């Protein structure tokens, strides 16, 4: 989310299970760069 | 050549030289304020 932050949560399953679970915070800082679009890294 | 030459110069640092000609090393310290997160802070005055 926009400054940018990142919540993350990492669960196996066995094309998503169909339930809820809340997010823990991972990343928090502001950097200046405005965010519009994104693509990942492979 | 004449009226021409090359800007920079060397500082003929000597132990023998008065002081207002030793050198001096400067560090100066800018402190800058961004938006970026702050990083940069001071030791925090806790207690028992």
Redesign the interface.
């Known amino acids: 989310k926009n400054?940018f932050k990142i919540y993350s949560k990492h669960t196996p399953i066995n094309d998503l299970p169909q339930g809820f679970s809340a997010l823990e915070p991972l990343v928090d800082?502001?950097?200046?760069i405005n965010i519009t679009r994104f693509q990942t890294l492979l | 050549g004449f009226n021409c030459y090359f800007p920079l110069q060397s500082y003929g640092f000597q132990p023998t030289n008065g002081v207002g000609y030793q050198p001096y090393r400067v560090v100066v310290l800018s402190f800058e304020l961004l938006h970026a997160p702050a990083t940069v802070c001071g030791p925090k005055k806790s207690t028992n």
Request: net charge neutral; charged share 0%; glycine share 20%.
């Open positions: 400054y800082l502001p950097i200046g």
